[PDB]
Design a protein around this ligand. Structure first.
Ligand SMILES: [K+]
Ligand SMILES: [Mg+2]
Ligand SMILES: [Mg+2]
Ligand SMILES: [Mg+2]
Ligand SMILES: [Mg+2]
Ligand SMILES: [Mg+2]
Ligand SMILES: [Mg+2]
Ligand SMILES: [Mg+2]
Ligand SMILES: [Mg+2]
Ligand SMILES: [Mg+2]
Ligand SMILES: [Mg+2]
Ligand SMILES: [Mg+2]
Ligand SMILES: [Mg+2]
Ligand SMILES: [Mg+2]
Ligand SMILES: [Mg+2]
Ligand SMILES: [Mg+2]
Ligand SMILES: [Mg+2]
Ligand SMILES: [Mg+2]
Ligand SMILES: [Mg+2]
Ligand SMILES: [Mg+2]
Ligand SMILES: [Mg+2]
Ligand SMILES: [Mg+2]
Ligand SMILES: [Mg+2]
Ligand SMILES: [Mg+2]
Ligand SMILES: [Mg+2]
Ligand SMILES: [Mg+2]
Ligand SMILES: [Mg+2]
Ligand SMILES: [Mg+2]
Ligand SMILES: [Mg+2]
Ligand SMILES: [Mg+2]
Ligand SMILES: [Mg+2]
Ligand SMILES: [Mg+2]
Ligand SMILES: [Mg+2]
Ligand SMILES: [Mg+2]
Ligand SMILES: [Mg+2]
Ligand SMILES: [Mg+2]
Ligand SMILES: [Mg+2]
Ligand SMILES: [Mg+2]
Ligand SMILES: [Mg+2]
Ligand SMILES: [Mg+2]
Ligand SMILES: [Mg+2]
Ligand SMILES: [Mg+2]
Ligand SMILES: [Mg+2]
Ligand SMILES: [Mg+2]
Ligand SMILES: [Mg+2]
Ligand SMILES: [Mg+2]
Ligand SMILES: [Mg+2]
Ligand SMILES: [Mg+2]
Ligand SMILES: [Mg+2]
Ligand SMILES: [Mg+2]
Ligand SMILES: [Mg+2]
Ligand SMILES: [Mg+2]
Ligand SMILES: [Mg+2]
Ligand SMILES: [Mg+2]
Ligand SMILES: [Mg+2]
Ligand SMILES: [Mg+2]
Ligand SMILES: [Mg+2]
Ligand SMILES: [Mg+2]
Ligand SMILES: [Mg+2]
Ligand SMILES: [Mg+2]
Ligand SMILES: [Mg+2]
Ligand SMILES: [Mg+2]
Ligand SMILES: [Mg+2]
Ligand SMILES: [Mg+2]
Ligand SMILES: [Mg+2]
Ligand SMILES: [Mg+2]
Ligand SMILES: [Mg+2]
Ligand SMILES: [Mg+2]
Ligand SMILES: [Mg+2]
Ligand SMILES: [Mg+2]
Ligand SMILES: [Mg+2]
Ligand SMILES: [Mg+2]
Ligand SMILES: [Mg+2]
Ligand SMILES: [Mg+2]
Ligand SMILES: [Mg+2]
Ligand SMILES: [Mg+2]
Ligand SMILES: [Mg+2]
Ligand SMILES: [Mg+2]
Ligand SMILES: [Mg+2]
Ligand SMILES: [Mg+2]
Ligand SMILES: [Mg+2]
Ligand SMILES: [Mg+2]
Ligand SMILES: [Mg+2]
Ligand SMILES: [Mg+2]
Lengths: 154, 386
RNA sequence: AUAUUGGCGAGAGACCGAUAGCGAACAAGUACAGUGAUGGAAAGAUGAAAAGAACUUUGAAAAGAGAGUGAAAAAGUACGUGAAAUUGUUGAAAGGGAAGGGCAUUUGAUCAGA
RNA sequence: GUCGAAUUUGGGUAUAGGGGCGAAAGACUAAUCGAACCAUCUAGUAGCUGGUUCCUGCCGAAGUUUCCCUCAGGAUAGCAG
RNA sequence: AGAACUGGCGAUGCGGGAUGAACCGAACGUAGAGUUAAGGUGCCGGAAUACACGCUCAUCAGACACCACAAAAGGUGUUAG
RNA sequence: GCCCUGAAAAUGGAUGGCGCUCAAGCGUGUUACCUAUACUCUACCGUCAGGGUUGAUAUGAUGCCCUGACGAGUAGGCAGGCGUGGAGGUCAGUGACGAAGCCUAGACCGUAAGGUCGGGUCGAACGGCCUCUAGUGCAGAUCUUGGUGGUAGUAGCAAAUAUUCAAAUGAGAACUUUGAAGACUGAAGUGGGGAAAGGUUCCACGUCAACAGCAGUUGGACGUGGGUUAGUCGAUCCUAAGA
RNA sequence: GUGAACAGCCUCUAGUUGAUAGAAUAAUGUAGAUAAGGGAAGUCGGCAAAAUAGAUCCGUAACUUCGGGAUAAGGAUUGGC
RNA sequence: AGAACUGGUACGGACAAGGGGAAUCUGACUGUCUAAUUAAAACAUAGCAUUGCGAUGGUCAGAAAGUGAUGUUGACGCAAU
RNA sequence: CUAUCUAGCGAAACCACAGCCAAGGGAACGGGCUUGGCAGAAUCAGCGGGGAAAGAAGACCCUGUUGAGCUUGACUCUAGU
RNA sequence: GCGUUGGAUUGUUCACCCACUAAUAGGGAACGUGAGCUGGGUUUAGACCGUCGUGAGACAGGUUAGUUUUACCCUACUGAU
RNA sequence: UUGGCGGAAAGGCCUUGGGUGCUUGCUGGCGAAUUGCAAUGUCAUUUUGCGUGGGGAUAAAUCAUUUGUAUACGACUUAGA
């Protein structure tokens, strides 16, 4: 427990999280922001379409020199990608949160992603060998991902 | 210190920037000066570049070493089916330039030109001009009011015309719509001409004639990103050059501490708007005229289409303009042929050319025969037939 | 009677308090490097007590969500507290080739005194 | 370039630091050579470079004199507290 | 580049010289009001598109010291002797 | 006198700019006006100086009060203070009903060093005053150690011809296994053994958190075990340069 | 097998099919090639590249230490049956 | 080795595989070195010449030795150029 | 084959703060200051003008009462003889 | 405004000559331009010569050989959203 | 409400007729206070939202697929009920 700052009704919410997930923190932040605030079913369909390369995750912060695509137009960007690994981890957490909501007895048709946050987990360190007998870091940037889906009320 | 050996700069700074044109149809940026005594006529025409061929003609140039001798000349064939008049725009002069006061459209617009107003035609409900065409309900009071405004104002009158791509072999199926300035006097008479020609076709012979100097306005062939060596014609660097030789060695002095606009850089080549002038019309041929490619010296009953068809274009089935030499743009591209902006009397213009022979051999190879009949005559009987 | 940075046994300190104090508070002259002589670290703290999370549920699983233990899980062995750099989310605000600052007031937010 | 002899090469063995070894380049002597590496003397010395950690209050300079193996330093008088 | 005297800058902000270590003015605790310095008062820009007598028309006009340059020689240009 | 000729340099550019022609130019004269941390007056802070007041309810004569002047500052000197670890004394000081620490565009005091309070967090100690003492205050030293960024999801993961289809396994297969096909090493091998070296890597079963710069169900990985059989092959023995 | 050949090229036995992949085919590169006419005018300099090349037959200069130079140079031929 | 026949006159058909000549400077040649910027004309070399020395010796080691190298040697030798 | 775009993976150099110019003045060549020109989010591939770009307490030069390699009837010594 | 060249010798700037030409003007831009090249010269270390020096060595004398690193950032520029 | 003029950015100018209200052109009647001696003492117009009525109209674009007149990626240009 002790998620990030949330503003929703805990009795109408269900939470899921995954820690120390070996997936790019930057790609997963973009993936999470892509579905932040979306209805749950809409977000799940969108992530499956991203996996199928029908729609893309707009890359808004970690996007320097990535590349341009026509699939960013629907989000008003030129830079978008298809981070399949990040999408898969987020889908796993979305499915877990949906299962927790159904265990809580929440209306699955009113669920939207009310909170989703990715922050950096401790780096997993490897080594890379460079010219003239030098050694540099070759670290992973894993992710803590948390999300909560809530019943949309008035 | 100074350059140490003088040489002209590479390229023309007046054709900058070497960027892609904003449209595939190059704009006519100037029409002929209006002479209000002549009858009302289009100042330009729309066509599609079909391809190139070669002609033979006697040169009429006294004093030349080839006077009265036969010369072989390259010619460009522009497929020019009649354009459909669908509108008229009135232009008022203002201290800020010309400004379109209003546009009056024809009552019925064919699907050819209606497709121009859609990005997804097949799935649209095709509502374009449906409410406008009701302005012709009983007496066309609104239409006549707008035309009266164009007469009361609008020191410049341009008709809206569109090509008939369905008559070309092109797969495009979406017509090209352009404003053509009406020269010939009496702004009232210009508007009357436009209204009477609404929904009607204007043929290329009503605009252009034999021997006339015309200008070709088109977007050149695209070549994508290009290095300086072929984009600007800069000298190739020596074979010994580290880091590559298709470059400009010095892209600038220390000061100004900036690369300057006048230095050759790699970038887009081609797909530029060009307006090339003084191309002489050699033929104004007609699509209905079989023996289009025949002359008074040849008499071989053949059309302008080469054996096997114009490569990457197809067959010429419409009226066509054959101009001397070459024009900007590649085959299948829409081109605008406009009348010359000045009166050229130079003995190069004013020359009356008479074609003696037009080459209709295949351009798909080293074509040896002008006609299938000639191929049959030379080769005799073959195994499959003939 | 004198010496004694070694050995053994003791008693102490206005000494240091885990980057300090011996290199070493810990399986430290250890791991590890070097052919070799030699060189030589890092590394203490859950909780009074493991009471170290039975059981249910989602997941292939790691795990999650509950439940539970506990004074506390804002103590879950990646464990006391848990700063800064740096980061996510949320909220607020501003933003024509930096940003930040001084004087003054407007506006918004916030607040003490009487 | 050379490729059947002043050839190439394994292993054993010898030569050790002002020493070796050198068909000689100051070359090589464990990525170290116009004197290897390791530890200690050693926190070597430095007129030279860099840094030198709280606040406020009051006073407030000198780059000049003489001497110096002195001229990027000091002593001395002067200026200052 | 080297001396003499003084004043400065260094060690010093402030107003002015657009800008600037040294020039001009003036040296500084925190504020208020008044008046000024040097410098300015078309607009930027606070402050007279003030008043007065003349001079100048430049197809490179001129426009405040330090200071950011111009000479000899010439001109029925124009002015006054 | 003013103006003009004399009067040529390199990015586009400077009476500061705009612009100005009976000037907004030049010479000269007269007024008004603008504004410096300067001058005048006033308050307040401090410093220095000269004084008054131990005659009582008088505990602050280092006090209180009166009067006048003054205030730039590097190097530097001196003074009065602020803060830290520890020590003697004291407040019979604070504290599990919450010490210390930490966070807090919340409040108060001080010119300032700093001090005090509230709120959150937290869990076992700590502080005021009088003195003592020092390993006592950091922005720098290409400072030391540790940690972390932007660069940046970027450079790149391109030598050694080359992969493909299907099935099986599996949660998951470009990469595992089997089959099929296409290729290569081409016997101076990408084959079969050894010497030095390594030391269990060999083999089986289980198995994927880390490692195999993609992946992974596979592995020279991880976990657990199994395995090296000599009178004849070596060492052992001999001597070689040498020790 | 070709071939003078332990060359190069292809194959049998054996082994491997391991090098992160997929998609596109811009510039500039790296590696590999070609080019009309000219033929070193390029450049410090023919750097790079090209040309030549095996074998059989013919023919082979100056010079020479009489050994060479020498594959000098310069010609011709080559398959299959 | 020869002959006939044969073909888009191809034929060492891929692979493989000298460019050549006329001269100058320089080192005779083969060989060697600056491992990691210099391969050379540098070093070495055979040849030539000089020098010392008959052992109680020449040249050279070792702190010293009842100690060593040349030397299992002897001037056609060893040592130094 | 790269570069390019995508999935996965994922560094480094460098970094006072940063990043548009002209002129001025200025430590006499400004990204910042002054005066002007101007100035509109977020960006991709290239590029080599500039960042007096990075790399390294200039190796040239001078200074130091700092060395070291080497040489010689330098000064002072010394093994050996 | 527009152009102001092709070559022989030399690293060369310069010079000089051949030749064409309308003409073969002079200059700047960090004596523009090396993360643009090249590296012939100069300008480490190898080597040769001559002169000088007892010598080590010296020579703005000659000669030969001698590693030319990095952009993916910002801006500028070229193109592209 | 009649009609006319106005396209430079017209979006306004003029004009006909009747209706309604006011009229300070002149003459009366009633009201005002306590906002306490001032406090802008709130009178304008800018956009947006919502609700109540009335009126009106009944699409596209992008992704994906496709073309190659285009193209590094975006972009472009085509096609598809
Ligand atoms: K030395
Ligand atoms: Mg970018
Ligand atoms: Mg890239
Ligand atoms: Mg590497
Ligand atoms: Mg290595
Ligand atoms: Mg020139
Ligand atoms: Mg061309
Ligand atoms: Mg090169
Ligand atoms: Mg053809
Ligand atoms: Mg320690
Ligand atoms: Mg600690
Ligand atoms: Mg070692
Ligand atoms: Mg701890
Ligand atoms: Mg607690
Ligand atoms: Mg903790
Ligand atoms: Mg923080
Ligand atoms: Mg030497
Ligand atoms: Mg010291
Ligand atoms: Mg003073
Ligand atoms: Mg100094
Ligand atoms: Mg000084
Ligand atoms: Mg001063
Ligand atoms: Mg000035
Ligand atoms: Mg004052
Ligand atoms: Mg004013
Ligand atoms: Mg004069
Ligand atoms: Mg003048
Ligand atoms: Mg003025
Ligand atoms: Mg005046
Ligand atoms: Mg006193
Ligand atoms: Mg003071
Ligand atoms: Mg202490
Ligand atoms: Mg507390
Ligand atoms: Mg804060
Ligand atoms: Mg405790
Ligand atoms: Mg200390
Ligand atoms: Mg610090
Ligand atoms: Mg400091
Ligand atoms: Mg540092
Ligand atoms: Mg560090
Ligand atoms: Mg990449
Ligand atoms: Mg690579
Ligand atoms: Mg490969
Ligand atoms: Mg297989
Ligand atoms: Mg092969
Ligand atoms: Mg093979
Ligand atoms: Mg195995
Ligand atoms: Mg991996
Ligand atoms: Mg993996
Ligand atoms: Mg499994
Ligand atoms: Mg194992
Ligand atoms: Mg045996
Ligand atoms: Mg054979
Ligand atoms: Mg050629
Ligand atoms: Mg040829
Ligand atoms: Mg020839
Ligand atoms: Mg030449
Ligand atoms: Mg030349
Ligand atoms: Mg030459
Ligand atoms: Mg060559
Ligand atoms: Mg021959
Ligand atoms: Mg010869
Ligand atoms: Mg030789
Ligand atoms: Mg070398
Ligand atoms: Mg070499
Ligand atoms: Mg020699
Ligand atoms: Mg500038
Ligand atoms: Mg200047
Ligand atoms: Mg700068
Ligand atoms: Mg400015
Ligand atoms: Mg901007
Ligand atoms: Mg580059
Ligand atoms: Mg640059
Ligand atoms: Mg230095
Ligand atoms: Mg140095
Ligand atoms: Mg001295
Ligand atoms: Mg010495
Ligand atoms: Mg230069
Ligand atoms: Mg440069
Ligand atoms: Mg360079
Ligand atoms: Mg250069
Ligand atoms: Mg050279
Ligand atoms: Mg040399
Ligand atoms: Mg001599």
């Amino acid at each position: 427990a002790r998620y990030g700052a949330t503003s929703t009704n805990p009795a109408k919410s269900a939470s899921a999280r995954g820690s120390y997930l070996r997936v790019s923190f930057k790609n997963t932040r973009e993936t999470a922001q892509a579905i932040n605030g979306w209805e749950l079913t809409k977000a799940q369909k969108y992530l499956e379409q991203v996996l199928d390369h029908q729609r893309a995750i707009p890359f808004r912060r970690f996007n320097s020199s990535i590349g341009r695509t026509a699939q960013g137009k629907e989000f008003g960007v030129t830079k978008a990608r298809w981070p399949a690994k990040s999408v898969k981890f987020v889908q796993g957490l979305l499915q877990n949160a949906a299962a927790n909501a159904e265990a809580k007895g929440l209306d699955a048709t009113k669920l939207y992603v009310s909170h989703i946050q990715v922050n950096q987990a401790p780096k997993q360190r490897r080594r890379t060998y460079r010219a003239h007998g030098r050694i540099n870091k070759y670290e992973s940037s894993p992710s803590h991902i948390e999300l909560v889906v809530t019943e949309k009320e008035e | 210190s100074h350059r140490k050996y003088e040489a002209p700069r590479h390229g023309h700074l007046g054709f900058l920037p070497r960027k892609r044109a904003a449209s595939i149809r190059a704009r006519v940026k100037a029409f002929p000066k209006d002479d209000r005594s002549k009858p009302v006529a289009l100042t330009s025409f729309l066509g599609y570049k079909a391809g190139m061929t070669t002609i033979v003609r006697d040169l009429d140039r006294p004093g030349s070493k080839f006077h009265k001798r036969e010369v072989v000349e390259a010619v460009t064939v522009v497929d020019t089916p009649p354009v459909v008049v669908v509108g008229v725009v009135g232009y008022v002069e203002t201290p800020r330039g010309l400004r379109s006061l209003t546009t009056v459209w024809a009552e019925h617009l064919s699907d050819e030109v209606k497709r121009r107003f859609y990005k997804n035609w097949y799935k649209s409900k095709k509502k374009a001009f449906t409410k406008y065409s009701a302005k012709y309900a009983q007496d066309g009071a609104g239409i006549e009011r707008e035309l009266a405004r164009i007469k009361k104002y609008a020191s410049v009158v341009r008709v809206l015309v569109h090509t008939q791509i369905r008559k070309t072999p092109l797969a495009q199926k979406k017509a090209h719509l352009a404003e053509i300035q009406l020269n010939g006097g009496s702004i009232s008479e210009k508007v009357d001409w436009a209204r009477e020609h609404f929904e009607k076709t204007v043929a290329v012979d009503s605009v252009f004639e034999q021997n006339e100097m015309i200008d070709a306005i088109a977007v050149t062939k695209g070549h994508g990103f290009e290095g300086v060596t072929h984009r600007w014609g800069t000298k190739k660097l020596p074979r010994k050059t580290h880091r590559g030789l298709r470059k400009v060695a010095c892209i600038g002095a220390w000061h100004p501490a900036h690369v300057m606009w006048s230095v050759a850089r790699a970038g887009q080549r081609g797909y530029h708007s060009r307006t090339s002038i003084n191309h002489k019309i050699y033929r104004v041929g007609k699509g209905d005229d079989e023996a289009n490619g025949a002359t008074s010296f040849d008499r071989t009953k053949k059309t302008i289409t080469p054996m096997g068809g114009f490569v990457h274009y197809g067959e010429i089935k419409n009226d066509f303009i054959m101009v001397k030499g070459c024009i900007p743009g590649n085959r299948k591209r829409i081109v605008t042929l406009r009348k010359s902006l000045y009166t050229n009397t130079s003995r190069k213009a004013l020359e009356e050319v008479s074609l003696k022979w037009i080459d209709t051999a295949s351009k798909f190879g080293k074509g040896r025969f002008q006609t299938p009949a000639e191929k049959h005559a030379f080769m005799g009987t073959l195994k499959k037939d003939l």
